[PDB]
Amino acid sequence: GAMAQNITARIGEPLVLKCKGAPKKPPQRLEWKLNTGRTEAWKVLSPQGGGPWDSVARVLPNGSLFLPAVGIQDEGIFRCQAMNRNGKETKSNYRVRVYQIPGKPEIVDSASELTAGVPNKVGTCVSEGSYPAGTLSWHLDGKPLVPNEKGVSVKEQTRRHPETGLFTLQSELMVTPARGGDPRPTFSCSFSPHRALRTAPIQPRVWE
Amino acid sequence: GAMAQNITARIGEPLVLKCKGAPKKPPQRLEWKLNTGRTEAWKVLSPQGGGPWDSVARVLPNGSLFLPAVGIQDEGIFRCQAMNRNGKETKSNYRVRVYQIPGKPEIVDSASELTAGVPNKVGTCVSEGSYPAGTLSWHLDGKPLVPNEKGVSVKEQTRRHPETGLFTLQSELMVTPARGGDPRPTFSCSFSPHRALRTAPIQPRVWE
Ligand SMILES: Cc1cccc2c(-c3cn[nH]c3)c(C(=O)O)[nH]c12
Ligand SMILES: Cc1cccc2c(-c3cn[nH]c3)c(C(=O)O)[nH]c12
Ligand SMILES: Cc1cccc2c(-c3cn[nH]c3)c(C(=O)O)[nH]c12
Ligand SMILES: Cc1cccc2c(-c3cn[nH]c3)c(C(=O)O)[nH]c12
Ligand SMILES: Cc1cccc2c(-c3cn[nH]c3)c(C(=O)O)[nH]c12
Ligand SMILES: Cc1cccc2c(-c3cn[nH]c3)c(C(=O)O)[nH]c12
Ligand SMILES: [Cl-]
Numbered sequence: 321g322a323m324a325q326n327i328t329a330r331i332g333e334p335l336v337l338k339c340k341g342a343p344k345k346p347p348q349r350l351e352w353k354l355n356t357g358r359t360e361a362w363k364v365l366s367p368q369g370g371g372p373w374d375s376v377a378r379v380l381p382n383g384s385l386f387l388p389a390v391g392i393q394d395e396g397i398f399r400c401q402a403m404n405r406n407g408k409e410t411k412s413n414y415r416v417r418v419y420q421i422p423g424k425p426e427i428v429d430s431a432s433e434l435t436a437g438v439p440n441k442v443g444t445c446v447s448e449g450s451y452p453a454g455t456l457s458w459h460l461d462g463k464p465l466v467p468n469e470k471g472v473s474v475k476e477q478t479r480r481h482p483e484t485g486l487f488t489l490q491s492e493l494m495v496t497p498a499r500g501g502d503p504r505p506t507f508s509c510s511f512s513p514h515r516a517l518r519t520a521p522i523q524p525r526v527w528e
Numbered sequence: 529g530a531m532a533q534n535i536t537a538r539i540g541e542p543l544v545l546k547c548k549g550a551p552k553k554p555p556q557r558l559e560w561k562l563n564t565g566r567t568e569a570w571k572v573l574s575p576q577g578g579g580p581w582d583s584v585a586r587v588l589p590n591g592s593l594f595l596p597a598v599g600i601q602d603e604g605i606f607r608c609q610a611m612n613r614n615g616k617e618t619k620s621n622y623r624v625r626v627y628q629i630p631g632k633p634e635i636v637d638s639a640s641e642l643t644a645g646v647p648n649k650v651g652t653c654v655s656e657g658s659y660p661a662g663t664l665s666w667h668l669d670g671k672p673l674v675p676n677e678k679g680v681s682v683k684e685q686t687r688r689h690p691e692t693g694l695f696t697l698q699s700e701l702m703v704t705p706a707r708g709g710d711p712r713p714t715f716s717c718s719f720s721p722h723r724a725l726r727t728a729p730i731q732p733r734v735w736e
Contacts, residue, residue, distance in 0.1 A: 332552045332553055332590050333552075333590055333592075334590070345540055380542055380596050380597065381540065381596060381597040382541055382542070382597065384541075384542065386594075388588050388589060389588065
C-alpha cells in the first residue's frame with residue numbers, strides 16, 4: 321500500500337482518526353474512504369452520514385472519523401482527504417489493526433512430582449480471549465524453555481469463540497528433567513501478543 | 529471539591545472520559561454524573577441514553593462518556609461510578625476545562641520611526657479566537673518588555689465574539705526609547721494561554 325500511520329485499536333474501545341488538514345468546524349470539503357472487513361473494496365463516508373454505516377462509524381464536527389466500539393471486522397485501511405479554506409489538499413492514511421488482551425494466563429492440571437530421566441507431563445496452560453491468537457511459552461526458573469530441545473516437548477491448541485472470534489490457547493508442557501538438577505524447579509507460563517502476562521509459578525519436586 | 533484528574537479539552541474536538549473499573553461491554557452497572565454550564569447542579573446520564581442529552585454526550589459500549597464536540601458550556605465536573613463483576617465500586621472524577629488556540633498574533637499599525645527621549649506609539653498587536661482570553665505581551669530584542677517601567681506603557685482591550693464566545697485581544701505598546709541605545713531595535717508580540725505564539729518582529733528606526 322502507501323505510507324500510513326499504524327494504529328492498533330482495542331476491540332470494544334472507541335477509535336477516533338483525525339482528518340489532518342481539515343477545517344476545524346463545518347463547512348468542510350472532506351471525504352473518508354475505508355476498506356475493512358465490513359466493506360467490499362472502498363467505502364466512502366461523508367460528513368452528512370446516513371444509512372447503516374451510522375451505527376458503525378460517523379464523521380465528527382471536526383471531520384474526524386469516530387468508531388464507538390472497534391470490532392474484528394474494522395481491521396483495514398482508513399483514508400481522509402481534505403481541503404482548507406486556503407485550498408490545499410491534505411491526505412491522511414491509517415493502517416488499523418485490532419487487538420484484544422486475554423485474561424491472565426492460568427496453569428491448570430500441574431504435576432506435583434517429576435521423575436528425572438523420563439519424560440514428565442508438567443502442566444497445561446490456558447489463555448482466554450485474545451485477538452490475534454498470540455502464543456503461550458514456558459519458563460524454567462526465569463529462563464525460557466525452548467521446545468524440541470533438551471527433552472522439552474510442547475504441544476499447543478487454538479480454539480475460537482463461536483461468536484466473539486476471540487482465541488483461547490492451551491499449551492501442554494512435557495520435560496525430561498536431568499539427573500542431578502534442581503530438585504525443586506520453578507515453571508511458569510507466559511502469554512505474548514504489548515507487554516507479557518505471566519502465570520503464577522509451579523514448583524514441583526523431582527526424583528533424582 | 530474532591531481529588532480529580534484535570535482534563536483540558538479543545539473547543540470543537542471530541543472528548544472521551546473513561547469510566548475506570550467498568551466492564552468492557554454491557555451489561556454494566558454504572559452511572560455518569562456531570563455538573564457543567566449545561567446543567568443545573570448534577571445531571572445523571574445513563575447507558576440507556578435518551579432525550580436531548582443524546583445530541584451532546586453519550587455513554588459508549590465500554591462505559592466511557594463521549595462528547596463529539598466540546599464547547600465552552602461543557603466546563604465543569606464529570607464523575608463516573610461503576611461496579612465490576614467482582615463487585616467492587618470504582619469511582620472516576622474529572623475536572624474538565626476547555627480552551628481554544630487563537631490564530632497567530634499580528635502586529636497592525638506599527639511605527640517605522642521612533643524618536644528617543646519621548647514616548648512613541650510602537651504598534652498594536654491583535655490575537656483572535658482564544659478561550660480563555662489569555663494575554664498579549666511585548667518583547668524587545670527577545671527580552672520581555674515590562675509595563676510601568678522605563679517609559680514602557682501597555683494598554684489592552686478584550687472583546688468577545690457575540691456567538692462563539694471566543695476572545696479577541698488588542699494590545700498597544702508605547703515606549704520612551706533611550707538616547708544612545710540600539711538605533712534599530714526589534715519588537716515582537718506574543719500570546720500566552722501550552723506554548724507561546726509570537727509575531728513577526730518589527731524593526732523601527734530610532735533617532736538618537
Ligand atoms: C441508504 C444508504 C446510505 C449510505 C450507505 C448505504 C449502504 C452501504 C454501502 N456500503 N455498505 C453499506 C446500504 C446497503 O448496504 O444496502 N444502504 C445505504
Ligand atoms: C447509544 C449510543 C452510544 C454511543 C454511540 C452511538 C451511535 C454512534 C455514534 N457514532 N457511531 C455510532 C448510535 C447510533 O446512532 O446508531 N447510538 C449510539
Ligand atoms: C495514498 C493516499 C493517502 C491518504 C488518502 C488518499 C486518497 C483519498 C481519500 N479520500 N479521497 C481520496 C487517495 C485516492 O483515492 O486517490 N489516495 C490516498
Ligand atoms: C435535562 C433534561 C431536560 C428535558 C428532558 C431530559 C431527559 C429525557 C430523558 N428521556 N426523555 C427526555 C433527560 C435524561 O434522562 O437524560 N434529561 C433531560
Ligand atoms: C442526537 C444527534 C443528532 C445528530 C448527530 C449526533 C451525534 C454525532 C454525529 N456525528 N458525530 C456525533 C451524536 C453523538 O454521537 O453524540 N448524537 C447526535
Ligand atoms: C468524590 C467522587 C469521585 C468520583 C465519583 C463520585 C460519585 C458518583 C458518581 N456517579 N455516581 C456517584 C459521588 C457521589 O455522588 O456519591 N462522589 C464521587
Ligand atoms: Cl465584547
